[PDB]
Amino acid sequence: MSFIPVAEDSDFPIQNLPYGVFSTQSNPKPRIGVAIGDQILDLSVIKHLFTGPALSKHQHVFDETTLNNFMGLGQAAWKEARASLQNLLSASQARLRDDKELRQRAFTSQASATMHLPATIGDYTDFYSSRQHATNVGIMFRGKENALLPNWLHLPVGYHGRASSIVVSGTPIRRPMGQMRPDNSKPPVYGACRLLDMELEMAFFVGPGNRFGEPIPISKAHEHIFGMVLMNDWSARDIQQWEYVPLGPFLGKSFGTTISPWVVPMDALMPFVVPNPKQDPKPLPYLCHSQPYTFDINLSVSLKGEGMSQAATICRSNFKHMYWTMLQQLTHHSVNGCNLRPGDLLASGTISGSDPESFGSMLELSWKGTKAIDVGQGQTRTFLLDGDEVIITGHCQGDGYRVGFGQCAGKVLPAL
Amino acid sequence: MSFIPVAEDSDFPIQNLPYGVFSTQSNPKPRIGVAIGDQILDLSVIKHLFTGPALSKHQHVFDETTLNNFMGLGQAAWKEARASLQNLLSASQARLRDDKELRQRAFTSQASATMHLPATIGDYTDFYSSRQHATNVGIMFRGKENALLPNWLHLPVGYHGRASSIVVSGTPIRRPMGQMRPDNSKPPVYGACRLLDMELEMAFFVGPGNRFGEPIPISKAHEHIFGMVLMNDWSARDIQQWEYVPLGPFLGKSFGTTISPWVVPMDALMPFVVPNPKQDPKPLPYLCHSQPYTFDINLSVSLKGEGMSQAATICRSNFKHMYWTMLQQLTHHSVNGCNLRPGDLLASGTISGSDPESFGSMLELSWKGTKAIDVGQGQTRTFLLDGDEVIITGHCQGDGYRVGFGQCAGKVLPAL
Ligand SMILES: C[As](C)(=O)[O-]
Ligand SMILES: C[As](C)(=O)[O-]
Ligand SMILES: [Ca+2]
Ligand SMILES: [Ca+2]
């Protein structure tokens, strides 16, 4: 443990050490920090303490307004940074601990900081890799006999997302206007979305890219995965339904996608690795690898309506319900020579387990609005109402510590 | 006329004046230039001559390595820059013309210049707005009675593309590996794409963005359109067919998309405006505007195999065929609150007219591999072969001058 006091139930013990971009009232310039207890350690202030071989000539990466350049340095640099931070934050090491003037400049409170997006996301991709989610959607729209489309068990299906509208936790999300077709015998209409939904996801940031035209082999895929965040892929389902054949989700997704700000490095999550789900049929060789790379990350979603005094927990799930791994997603994404770049964000798709309490959208929880979701205090939902606030949280549970993700929150504003 | 001599068939008379980013052997810094005749005027060198009200405090935008900041300044700035350039390049003006020292440093031959991508593209979107293209694809894959899907005549269908693999003209494109399902009785296979295609498009760059959550009304859409380039959306059709239901084109597109480097400003194209195609049914009011915004731009595509000495013209088309205008595309793209940003690229979709000589893909020109494309010199094609070079060109034709785009070229390399 650390010289910084850490509560037992803190998301940010010395075993975590996530990376984020923050600013304060006194200094509005976005800069890189690491969460520890209820504090932020400012890496722009302590960049000269990274004296090892991988970082000593790259200390400027900690002075940037985004994590992109640090992400681009690759695994040796990340591992050295983490070892340096663990040694510096240890309760028995004197350097940062006993340098009072440095320490006063280096640490500020999380409760007084403003968080920003952790990276400039050049490209965002959303996969569809949770089998029960894809199955549930298939049942609802095609029937139980056509629950999965023919390609789903053969490749990690995904689409290009909209990068510009990825926003940091806490950003209000306006209910979108657009066109929809509620009656198939009549022309489409223009109006406010009536089926506004959340999608519980996680996403990973890419480290070093691959060269244009050069695939990343699955055996090297783990080298390019920096760390993870929580995501809410807000969805306008009536807009989506009318637009999306044949070229895919578009305006139904691109009005807003929220991510949490603290990027938990893969090294912090490796203690919580579990076996990959068995795949049948077995994937082609380029997607076949024996490295365990599925993670036991508890996820929870709450909803609170304006007026309501307390939030209701509407979903309890886990990131281990993903059939295609992050290694397979990254490999598939580059198999054609596509060039992944530092700070790219590859998301899981909606996470659903087989238990109905773990379904990751209100589309599934309400089963296409045929079941009312109990949100407490005599109130019910099918889809989101104006003023509803959705908060996603997640953590890995260790013995006496948690590796937590903070929150991924947003409140719905009325259409405009 | 300019003091720089311009050939009658030059793409770059004083009536054009497109913006691009170039470097030279002498100076490796990517920098902003304007094409005139066979020369480039370096805007960083003459940035102090922009003394008007819109540009006087924004001269640093011409020192940047990309056009994004200039694009973000908006129409008054673009109009002022253009007016200043037309004055400074005029045959009858002395300021630049008679300054031998400055001229020496301000001009460079295009033959000496390496072109770069003109902007950092935060998000690329590909629309699908040619009626004959969508109809042709519909006939080939669904049958003649089901040419168009139900939403096509009601909104400008489009999808999010991959930004990272947009490359400048001249970049070699490697035939992609991936997964394909050549027939339906066996499992999918891994191998080199067998059905590699080009797609003739044009694309426009966004100027000032809109705020997250705030739509751009169609009456203001023209304020956000900076200028245009040529595009080849290279397509791996067998990869695409297996992957694309239900989330849309993905690895079938993202291995490479080529654009030409010279951004022709909308002001150069306005003399060549024609009436918009009549729409029936009439679109919803948010997509309804009377401003002509369809452009008479001649387009040509050539193919040259690696053993050929003459390239064959395989497509002659025109941007005026497109059913949905750029105004409608930009309006639709932001109707849900999605935030377009300076330097975003919004492409037209494959441009096909009704004449079979104007079909914009080899998929259409070979009618799904059923007809041989004559490429001259005893040779035919259905789809692209290794070593084939595809070159797209375009121009508007005036009286004694043209507004042209230069080349949009790429050569196919063999798969790994
Ligand atoms: C791609 As979906 C069915 O999770 O909106
Ligand atoms: C979306 As297409 C049919 O022009 O590959
Ligand atoms: Ca999603
Ligand atoms: Ca295309």
Q: How far is Cα A84 from Cα B45, in angstroms, rounded to an integer?
A: 46
Contacts of B191 in chain A (CB under 8 A): none
| CA distances to A40, A66, A274, A297 from A18, in Å | 10, 14, 21, 15
Residues A326 and A310 in one domain: yes
Of residues A165, A172, A195, A197, the one with CA closest to residue A182: A195
Best residue in B336, B346, B412 for a mutation probing chain A (most A CBs within 10 Å):
B336
Residue of B350, B351, B359 with the most ligand 2 atoms within 8 Å of its CB, for mutation: B350
Token pair in block for residue A192: 């406010």
Q: How far is the CA of B329 from the centre of ligand 4 (A)?
A: 15
Residue finishing a domain among B80, B98, B114 = B114
Burial label for B145, CB within 10 Å (0-12, 13-18, 19+), is: exposed
Contact between residue B260 and residue B406 where contact means Cβ atoms under 8 Å apart: yes
Those residues whose C-beta lies under 8 Å from the C-beta of residue B257, and which sit 6 or more positions away, are B124, B161, B162, B165, B166, B167, B231, B232, B233, B234
DSSP state of B131: H
Ligand 2 in contact with B199 (CB < 6 A)?
A: yes
Residues A290 and A272 in one domain: yes
Residues A104 and A126 in one domain: no
Q: Which residue has the tokens 């064959």?
A: B312
Residues B88 and B204 in one domain: no
Residues B354 and B256 in one domain: yes
Angle at A128 between CA A153 and CA B193, to 5 degrees: 60
Amino acid at B8: E
A228 bridge partner residues: A204, A264
Residues A166 and A136 in one domain: yes
3-class state of residue A307 by DSSP: coil
Best residue in A247, A328, A416 for a mutation probing chain B (most B CBs within 10 Å):
A247
A225 bridge partner residues: A206
φ, ψ of residue B362 in degrees (nearest 5): -75, -25
DSSP state of A303: E
| CA distances to A309, B103, B144, B146, B353 from B135, in Å | 55, 52, 8, 9, 11
Angle at B75 between CA B69 and CA B76, to 5 degrees: 100
Amino acid at B373: I
Angle at A334 between CA A218 and CA A230, to 5 degrees: 85
Q: How far is Cα B307 from Cα B388, in angstroms, rounded to an integer?
A: 9
3-class state of residue B138 by DSSP: helix
The CATH number for B45's domain is 2.30.30.230
- Taking phi first (over 0 means left), then psi (-120 to 50 degrees means alpha), and beta for anything else, what does residue B17 get? left
Angle at B405 between CA B394 and CA B358, to 5 degrees: 15
Residues 86-145 of B with CB under 8 A from A: 122-123, 128
Considering CB atoms only, which of B158, B173, B338 is closest to A165? B338
DSSP state of A396: E
Amino acid at B279: Q
Residues B356 and B214 in one domain: yes
Token pair in block for residue A331: 């490999």
Q: How far is the CA of A314 from the centre of ligand 4 (A)?
A: 40
Q: How far is Cα A117 from Cα A135, in angstroms, rounded to an integer?
A: 32
Residue finishing a domain among B73, B90, B114 = B114
Of residues B59, B390, B116, B111, the one with CA closest to residue B263: B116
Q: What ligand 1 atom has the least distance to the C-alpha of A199?
A: 4
Greatest distance between any 2 Cα atoms in chain B? 75
Q: How far is Cα A290 from Cα A270, in angstroms, rounded to an integer?
A: 15
From which experimental method does this structure derive? Answer: X-ray
Residues A290 and A397 in one domain: yes
Ligand 2 in contact with B350 (CB < 6 A)?
A: yes
Q: How far is Cα A64 from Cα A70, in angstroms, rounded to an integer?
A: 9
A21: closest CA of chain B, how far (Å): 20
Domain-embedded: residue A174: yes
B146: closest CA of chain A, how far (Å): 13
Contact between residue A345 and residue A207 where contact means Cβ atoms under 8 Å apart: no
Q: Which residue has the tokens 């009618």?
A: B367
Percent helix, strand, coil in chain A, to 5, is 25, 30, 50
Q: How far is Cα A303 from Cα A313, in angstroms, rounded to an integer?
A: 7
Of residues B317, B351, B397, B366, the one with CA closest to residue B231: B351
Residues A328 and A264 in one domain: yes
User: What residues sit around ligand 3, an ion, with C-beta below 5 angstroms?
Assistant: A 126, 199, 233
Amino acid at A93: Q
Those residues whose C-beta lies under 8 Å from the C-beta of residue A224, and which sit 6 or more positions away, are A206, A207, A208, A209, A210, A216, A330, A340
Q: Reported resolution in A?
A: 1.5
Considering CB atoms only, which of B167, B178, B242 is closest to A336? B178
Q: How far is Cα A205 from Cα A260, in angstroms, rounded to an integer?
A: 12
Residues B82 and B221 in one domain: no
B22 bridge partner residues: B31, B115
HSE-up of residue B331 (Cα within 13 Å, Cβ side): 21
| CA distances to A369, B80, B249, B369 from B16, in Å | 56, 15, 35, 39
A293 annotated binding-site participant: no
- Tell me the residue range of the domain where B10 lies: 2-114
Examine the residue annotation and report whether A289 is marked as an active-site residue of this protein.
no
Cross-chain Cβ contact B251/A341 below 8 Å: no
Residues B378 and B303 in one domain: yes
3-class state of residue A89 by DSSP: helix
Domain-embedded: residue B36: yes
The CATH number for B330's domain is 3.90.850.10
Q: How far is Cα B88 from Cα B264, in angstroms, rounded to an integer?
A: 18
Those residues whose C-beta lies under 8 Å from the C-beta of residue B7, and which sit 6 or more positions away, are B37
Contacts of A154 in chain B (CB under 8 A): 179, 187-188
Of residues A343, A270, A341, the one with CA closest to residue A21: A343
3-class state of residue B139 by DSSP: helix
Residue finishing a domain among B64, B87, B114 = B114
Residues B132 and B233 in one domain: yes
Of residues A123, A190, A128, the one with CA closest to residue A342: A123
Tally the domains of chain A: 2
> Which chain A residue lies closest to B172 (C-alpha atoms)?
A213
Greatest distance between any 2 Cα atoms in chain A? 75
Q: Which residue has the tokens 């054609």?
A: A336
Of residues A329, A282, A328, A345, the one with CA closest to residue A158: A329
Those residues whose C-beta lies under 8 Å from the C-beta of residue A385, and which sit 6 or more positions away, are A305, A412
Q: How far is Cα B343 from Cα B332, in angstroms, rounded to an integer?
A: 18
DSSP character string of B335-364:
TTS----TT-EEE------SSGGG--BHHH
Domain-embedded: residue B413: no
